[PDB]
Structure formats: C-alpha cells, structure tokens
C-alpha cells in the first residue's frame, strides 16, 4: 500500500491505542491481511482415470438413448439455414455433432447456432458429452473413439 | 469534577421541568385608542391611559 | 385451569375487637399478624390484602414474662451523629403504650408496600374505649 512507514504517534503519553503503521489492515485504507496473488487452479488427472470417466459417460449416454449414430452427416453449402432445416427433420435442437473429418461447410453452418456444436473425434471433452441433450456421432467417428479409449 | 456514568434522557427531561416559559396573563386595553398594550407601559402609538404621550 | 386468585376489589373484610389485658405480648402479636395478613382465610393470596380490621383495647396492660418489663430495650437512631436513643419496656408503656403492640406487630408483617397496607388495618388504643361502634366490631377471644 502506498504510504510512509512513519509511526503515526508516539508509543506512550497519548490516550490512544498503539499505532505502528498507517497501512495496518485494522485501519481504513490499510492493506489486506492475506491479500491474494494470481494462482493456478488446474488439477492433475491420471490418464487412466480420465479415460475411465469418458467410457462411463459414453456408456450412460447409450443407456439413456442420448447417443445417436448415423452413417454420415454433412451439408451441401455453408449456410446456417440448411443445417437448421436438417436438424428439424431429425427432431434435434440441442445436439453435439462429432465427425471424423471436420468439414469446413458443416463447421461454418453451425457457428451461429448456439445450441449446436460441431467437434472432431479428437476434440471431445467430458463436460461437452454431458452438457448437450443429444450426441450425434458418425460411424467413422465411432471407430476413431475406440482406439483413443481402447 | 466529571460524571462517572452517562445521565439518561429521563433525567435530562426531569431537570428541564422547571424551564417552561410563562405567557403574559392578559393585556391592558387603552381607554382612548383601544389598542392592546403591556400593563403600565405605553402603547405602540404613544398612548398611556388615554393621554396621548409623546409619539415622535 | 388456573389457580384461583383473590380480587382486591371484591374481597370481604370484617371488623374485630380484641382485649389485650393480661395477654403475652409476643403470642398476641403473632395472632394479630396472622389475621391482618389473611392467612386464616381459604382465599389467601400472597399479593392481595385479604385480612381483617382489628381493634386492640387496653394496650397498656399487656404482659411480659421474666424480667423483660425492665430489661427489654427499644433502640432507634435519629439520623444524627449522636443518634442512638433507647427506652425500656417500662418507659415505653408509661409514655406511648400503643407503640409497644404496634412495634411488635410491624416486625411480624411482611416488608414492602403491601405489608405497610396491612398495618393500616390495626387500631390500637391504650384505654378500654373506642369510637368505631359504627363498624360493629365482633368480639374476638384471642
């Protein structure tokens, strides 16, 4: 805290409590007793534990019928209107789409839809698999996941 | 020299029970001009007992 | 249900006359205090005065056992530095005979505003005559 280290007043003689610094945390405008510092909140996750969690999540999705497998999933042009119409036919509104190859046309179409996310087979994370109501995975995408999880 | 305890608002009110002012019982009326005035005092217009004392 | 409580504005008080000639001071006083407090009534309530009015006659003829007639001393302080004054039982009887019974009964009654109120119902006379005939006191052989 900006200020001088001078004693505000002498130790004895005045009828006031002891003071040694104007920056004492007791005083107004003083420093914070345990002032915070920037810190890293990341935690370690064992490789096997992380892989085990993904397998449990995927199994639960199949149990709850929240996982849908399709032969292919693509759009003709990078237009949001086409993708939105496609999802209406399949009765999907909040879905996560995983594809083996991240087609640029599909990626651009889904950009403006905040309830739709397009991810690569290697880009799946545990939170995403749970956050979205439904998960759509292509047949080739299903194959890729198997070796990653083994 | 100084108090050892803070007196209460009740004690403050009790001490002030004798501080009330007293209003004049009544005002005299001049026999000639008819204006009210303090008894044994000249009126604002300079009258006293209907004699028209100096009013310069 | 709640226990019954006497009401100060609906309590019945009677009048009695007692002759103190030849009666022991202390034993007479206890009975007077008991009746002034209303302890003899089934409607007795500690915070209500349910006693009776008592008239005491011949207060100057009370009796005391032993040598108390000349040895019992009544002390009282006037509030000044000298203050301490005393009078024997014989002196009190000669000067203020009524005070002898009055003092004894007062010490036997509860202390406080209610106890003071109880004492107001006791009438003590040195002679054998009283002027409370209008109240029709009933003879009490106590």
């Amino acid at each position: 805290v900006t200020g001088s280290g001078k004693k505000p007043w002498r130790q004895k003689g005045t009828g006031r409590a002891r003071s040694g610094s104007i920056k004492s945390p007791i005083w107004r405008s003083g420093g914070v007793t345990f002032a915070a510092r920037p810190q890293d909140h990341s935690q370690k996750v064992n490789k096997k534990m992380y892989r085990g969690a993904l397998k449990s999540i995927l199994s639960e999705l199949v149990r709850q019928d929240r996982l849908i497998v399709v032969e292919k999933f693509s759009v003709e042009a990078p237009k949001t209107k086409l993708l939105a119409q496609k999802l209406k036919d399949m009765a999907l509104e909040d879905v996560l789409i995983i594809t083996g190859e991240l087609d640029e046309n599909l990626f651009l179409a889904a950009r403006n839809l905040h309830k739709v996310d397009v991810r690569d087979a290697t880009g799946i994370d545990p939170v995403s698999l749970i956050a979205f109501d439904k998960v759509v995975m292509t047949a080739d995408a299903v194959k890729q996941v198997e070796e990653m999880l083994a | 020299a100084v108090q050892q305890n803070k007196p209460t608002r009740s004690k403050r009110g009790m001490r002030r029970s004798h501080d009330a002012l007293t209003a004049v019982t009544s005002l005299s009326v001049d026999k000639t001009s008819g204006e009210k005035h303090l008894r044994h005092h000249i009126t604002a217009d300079g009258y006293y007992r209907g004699r028209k004392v100096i009013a310069k | 249900m709640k226990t019954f409580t006497a009401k100060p504005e609906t309590v019945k008080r009677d009048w009695y006359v007692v002759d103190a000639t030849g009666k022991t001071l202390g034993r007479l006083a206890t009975e007077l205090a008991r009746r002034l407090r209303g302890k003899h009534k089934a409607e007795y309530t500690p915070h209500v005065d349910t006693g009776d009015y008592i008239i005491v006659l011949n207060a100057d003829k009370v009796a005391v056992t032993g040598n108390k007639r000349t040895d019992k001393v009544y002390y009282h302080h006037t509030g000044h530095i000298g203050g301490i004054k005393q009078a024997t039982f014989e002196e009190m009887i000669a000067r203020r005979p009524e005070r002898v019974i009055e003092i004894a009964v007062k010490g036997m009654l509860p202390k406080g505003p209610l106890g003071r109120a109880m004492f107001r119902k006791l009438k003590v006379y040195a002679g054998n005559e009283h002027n409370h005939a209008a109240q029709q006191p009933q003879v009490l052989d106590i």
Binding site: - | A20, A23, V24, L27 | -
Partner: protein, 110 residues
C-alpha cells in the same frame, strides 16, 4: 382543512425554539399572535413569522376565515449542524456546533 407553513434551516437550536412553541400550542391564532408579540425571545420572532405565513396561506390557498383558525399542531425538528473550530489554550482545538432547526406550524378551522 389544515394549512401548513414551515421555516427550514432556521439559525437556532431546537431546544430554544421549543420553549416558545409550547406557549401557543392549541391556542387561537389571534391569541397566539398576542402571546408571541410580548415574548422577549429571539425564537418568538421566528415563530411569529411562520404563524403569520400559515394564516396567509389559509386565506389565499384554502379560502378560510381567520376568526375560526387555531394552532392545532406545532413542532420543531433538529436541522443540519454546521461544524466550526474554536482554538483553546495550549494549542488544543475544539469543535463548535451551530445547530439549526425546522419549524412547522399547522392551522386548522376545527
């Protein structure tokens, strides 16, 4: 119908003004004016002006008759205090409060 007149931020402590106010509480306006005229207090001048203003408000705004008016309510409230410094001996400083007050007068035809 009751008419209100106020004098806010008057230069006088509420305690001093309250002494005069209690003299005219509940009195007829004509009688109240006479009492204030012959009261040798500074607060009397302040209170009289408020009472006169209340009477004037009744005629102009409410169309009332003065002969029927009386001081139904009157009270004095503490106002903001002005802080000042008064030097004392041996270099000590003291705080001086210049207290003010709000004067309210209500006149009604009741």
């Amino acid at each position: 119908m009751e008419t209100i007149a106020k004098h806010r931020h008057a230069r006088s402590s509420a305690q001093k003004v309250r002494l005069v106010a209690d003299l005219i509480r509940g009195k007829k306006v004509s009688q109240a004016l006479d009492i204030l005229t012959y009261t040798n207090k500074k607060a009397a001048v302040l209170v009289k002006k408020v009472l006169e203003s209340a009477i004037a408000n009744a005629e102009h705004n409410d169309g009332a008759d003065i002969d029927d008016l009386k001081v139904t309510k009157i009270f004095v409230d503490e106002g903001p205090s002005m802080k000042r410094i008064m030097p004392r001996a041996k270099g000590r400083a003291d705080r001086i409060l210049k207290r003010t007050s709000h004067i309210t007068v209500v006149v009604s035809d009741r």
